[PDB]
Design a protein around this ligand. Structure first.
Ligand SMILES: CCCCCCCCCCCCCCCCCC(=O)OC[C@H](COP(=O)(O)OCCN)OC(=O)CCCCCCCCCCCCCCCCC
Ligand code: HEM
Ligand code: HEM
Lengths: 73, 89, 100, 378, 83, 55
């Protein structure tokens, strides 16, 4: 929370960083980005979507039952 | 220029730095430069050449930074870059 | 018993064996857990901060490790639990001494 | 040594915007702090121009607003910026709250409580501003919510004839709501500074919930250009909303003048307050309805007192993850049910959605948490 | 065998200087070189190099001092810019 | 193509400020030309300029 210097304690850890003018802007943005987005999609839709298909069923069923209540008359 | 003259002449004195100079001056250059020619190339240097060559080499390049030890407060590389050049800051 | 099968499937699908973390790299830190982290040997503590820094790196790039380096459930070297139990026992003993 | 590290202003700017240690992991969901800040100053500026062209009286308010949107140069785009900026302000506010609830950042106490007070303040401010155009929906919204304040016995009726400025929605009500809408965002800015102060005391979070004390990167110039990117995305969404379909979110029923005699059939809030109105009309009891609404936002106060898990985030707890997405779909269901009329299937599933909201929060989070605490041998 | 190959590759014809400073005689030094370095019998490298520019840090928090070097690319041997 | 551009307009800072001002003015001119061109190209016919030309 404070400034740098007195936060943690690390022993021997080596970090390499390349220059930004040295390397490309988008490293393989259409050969790894598509498998990464399909992987992150496949690892989340089974936990996100089965409530939303229930919401879609509730919306359609409520529309159909309101039309059921009003389309006899 | 005074510090360069004093350091160079006080270094090339004795026997061992002299002979080191002979070795590294015949390998790298092809000839050992006598110090009168170094005096000539010092006399060919004013403030204009210094600031133009330093604007050619120091200013706006990509450094090699190498750190060892407790270096958490060492900046990330883009802070070294934003401190390298001037917008007159 | 099949509840161990639930635990193995859960440790597979829980998402913290993906990033190369073991069981006690994800513990939430109140005062007790901060004390139990400070009570560690040096080699385990350095291995711990290294695995944590790799996890933050891999979640920064949002890339998850290859198949040959996932942490496996059979070799679950959970280590932080004895020190954390000792912290909880001494804390509850101090609380009971204050209550009576 | 340096200008920045000695000067009394630039130490504040240094501990805010330049050398603040921020974690190297935060995703796009940690942009909505800066997006709420930029939306707040954009609301203040465009509203200040609207307040330069506005005459707050019940005779001439609607006439003056029509004068803005016809006769003053660019008053139509400044008014549309103000209204749809309120809409995008509450989009980014609920995404900010959803982040702070999902990733276990409610283990912070004082930042969370000052957050909830900011939520109260922004909701009251946006309601008073929605009263200000003096249309039919604004008139009846003011009337019904002031009688909701009159619902409470022994305090209510005197308090409501006190803030009515009379005995109904008279001139004084429009002028009172002009003044309080025209002062409250400065208090929101001050409490936002207090919010940000307690944050910079503690330290931020990350998508893993592991404390990131090893890998802090400075705020400038990584997250500054990340927030510029977020701001450009927000301004293009806001501006496409105000330049192509400005009526796609706003009410059609506003644009009639305030006749206190008609009471249109489809009375409703502006769309951000639908679930507050859906908890209300799905309980057939007056005090029960207003108390259940206040208990909803006080349940958001309660939420730090039920963190009985032992991870921090919900990234690593899939059961609580699925229950949180059930909670999100249930709140969107409440918004949809509030934005409808009131009949028999709507009555039933409005009651069921409110019940399932309270059951998910107050019961299902600790039951999922104790199955988590049991299941990983802790 | 690798060491013998190293010794038998690098040390031959142009790339060695017999340097002699101090109170000696140039004739004698040339004559002694002519005597002893006979039979040495010497008879394909130096590409330009890439100055990448990067940052390496070796964090070790158990030490009392921080050591930081930083370099940009210098001109080389054959420039007045070196002076 | 790029080397002359960096050698001229990106070493110093004042030249960079001068070229972003001059580029913003040239972009103003050409962009308003293109904008009115496209907008009165997809609404050819029912626009007030041609109806003024009737009169
Ligand atoms: C309409 C709602 C639209 C929501 C769209 C969400 C899209 C992303 C969904 C997703 O991917 O969820 C899983 C993800 C898991 O977290 P993470 O570790 O970042 O992911 C790595 C592996 N997935 O999680 C995420 O990416 C983000 C998880 C959700 C965070 C935002 C919450 C949404 C807004 C909630 C609003 C209501 C909150 C309560 C308000 C109460 C008011 C009274
Ligand atoms: C008035 C509207 C609000 C504004 C302008 C606001 C502003 C901010 C800002 C600028 C930050 C720091 C950046 C960030 O972490 O995203 C922040 C953090 C936070 N706010 Fe708010 N906030 C508001 C409302 C709320 C509300 C209603 C809550 C919920 C009670 C809340 C809870 C939090 C939390 C938990 C954090 C820390 C998040 C983290 O470190 O990851 N805020 N807020
Ligand atoms: C202190 C800063 C603010 C000023 C000076 C201000 C000023 C005004 C003025 C003059 C109006 C009447 C014009 C109109 O109705 O279109 C108005 C309306 C409104 N304001 Fe504000 N406002 C401010 C802050 C906010 C904030 C923070 C919000 C919420 C995000 C907000 C939401 C609204 C809404 C929803 C309306 C009704 C818009 C409509 O229906 O056309 N205002 N404001």
């Amino acid at each position: 929370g404070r400034q740098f210097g007195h936060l943690t304690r690390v022993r021997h850890v080596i970090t390499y960083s390349l220059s930004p003018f040295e390397q490309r802007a988008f490293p393989h943005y259409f050969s790894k980005g598509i498998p990464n987005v399909l992987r992150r999609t496949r690892a989340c839709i089974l936990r996100v979507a089965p409530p939303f298909v229930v919401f879609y069923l509730v919306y359609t069923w409520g529309t159909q039952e309101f039309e059921k209540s009003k389309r006899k008359n | 220029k005074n510090l360069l003259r004093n350091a160079l002449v006080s270094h090339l004195d004795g026997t061992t730095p002299v002979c080191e100079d002979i070795g590294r001056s015949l390998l790298t250059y092809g000839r050992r430069i006598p110090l009168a020619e170094w005096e000539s190339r010092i006399a060919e240097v004013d403030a204009r050449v210094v600031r133009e060559v330093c604007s050619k080499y120091f200013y706006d390049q990509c450094p090699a930074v190498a750190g060892f030890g407790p270096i958490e407060q060492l900046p990330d590389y883009n802070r070294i870059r934003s401190g390298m050049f001037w917008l007159r800051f | 018993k099949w509840l161990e099968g639930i635990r193995k499937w859960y440790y597979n699908a829980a998402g913290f064996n993906k990033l190369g973390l073991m069981r006690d790299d994800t513990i939430h830190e109140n005062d007790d857990v901060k004390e139990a982290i400070r009570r560690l040997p040096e080699n385990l503590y350095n291995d711990r901060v290294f695995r944590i820094k790799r996890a933050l790196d891999l979640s920064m790039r949002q890339q998850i490790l290859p198949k040959e380096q996932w942490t496996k459930y059979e070799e679950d070297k959970f280590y932080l639990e004895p020190y954390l139990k000792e912290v909880i026992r001494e804390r509850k003993e101090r609380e009971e001494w204050t209550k009576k | 040594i340096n200008i920045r590290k000695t000067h009394p202003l630039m130490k504040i700017v240094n501990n805010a915007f330049i050398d603040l240690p921020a974690p190297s992991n935060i995703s796009s969901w940690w942009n909505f702090g800066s997006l709420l800040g930029i939306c707040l100053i954009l609301q203040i500026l465009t509203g200040l121009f609207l307040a330069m062209h506005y005459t707050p009286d019940t005779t001439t308010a609607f006439s003056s607003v029509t004068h803005i949107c016809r006769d003053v140069n660019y008053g139509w785009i400044i008014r549309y910026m103000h209204a749809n900026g309120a809409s995008m302000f509450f989009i980014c506010l609920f995404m900010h709250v959803g982040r702070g609830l999902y990733y276990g950042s409610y283990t912070f106490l004082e930042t969370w409580n000052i957050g909830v007070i900011l939520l109260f303040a922004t909701m009251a401010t946006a309601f008073m501003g929605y009263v200000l155009p003096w249309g039919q929906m604004s008139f009846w919204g003011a009337t019904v919510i002031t009688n909701l304040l009159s619902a409470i016995p022994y305090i209510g009726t005197n308090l409501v004839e006190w803030i009515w400025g009379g005995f109904s929605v008279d001139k004084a009500t429009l002028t009172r709501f002009f003044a309080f809408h025209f002062i409250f965002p400065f208090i929101i800015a001050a409490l936002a500074m207090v919010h940000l102060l307690f944050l910079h005391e503690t330290g931020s979070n990350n998508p893993t919930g592991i404390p990131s004390d090893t890998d802090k990167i400075p705020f400038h110039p990584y997250y500054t250009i990340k927030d510029i990117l977020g701001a450009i995305l927000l301004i293009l969404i806001l501006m496409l909303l105000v330049l192509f379909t400005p009526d796609l979110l706003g009410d059609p029923d506003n644009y009639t003048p305030a006749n206190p005699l008609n009471t249109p059939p489809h009375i409703k809030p502006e769309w951000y307050f639908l679930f507050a109105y859906a908890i209300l009309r799905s309980i057939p009891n007056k005090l029960g309805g207003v108390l259940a609404l206040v208990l909803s936002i006080l349940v958001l106060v309660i939420m730090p007192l039920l963190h009985t898990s032992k991870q921090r985030s919900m990234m690593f707890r899939p059961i609580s993850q699925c229950m949180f997405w059930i909670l999100v779909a249930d709140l969107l269901t409440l918004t949809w049910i509030g934005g409808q009329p009131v009949e028999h299937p709507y009555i039933i599933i409005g009651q069921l959605a409110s019940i399932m909201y309270f059951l998910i929060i107050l019961v299902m989070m600790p039951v999922a948490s104790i199955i988590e605490n049991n299941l990983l041998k802790w | 065998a690798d060491l013998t190959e190293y010794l038998s590759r690098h040390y031959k014809a142009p790339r060695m200087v017999l340097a002699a400073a101090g109170g000696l005689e140039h004739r004698q030094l040339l004559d002694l070189a002519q005597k002893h370095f006979s039979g040495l019998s010497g008879t394909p490298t130096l590409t330009p190099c890439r100055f990448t520019g990067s940052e390496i840090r070796h964090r070790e928090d158990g030490l009392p001092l921080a050591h930081v070097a930083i370099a940009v690319e210098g001109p080389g041997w054959a420039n007045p810019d070196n002076v | 193509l790029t080397a002359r551009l960096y050698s001229l307009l990106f070493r110093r800072t004042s030249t960079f400020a001068l070229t972003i001002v001059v580029g913003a003015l040239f972009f103003e001119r050409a962009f308003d030309q293109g904008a009115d061109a496209i907008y009165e190209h997809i609404n050819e016919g029912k626009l007030w300029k041609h109806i003024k030309h009737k009169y």
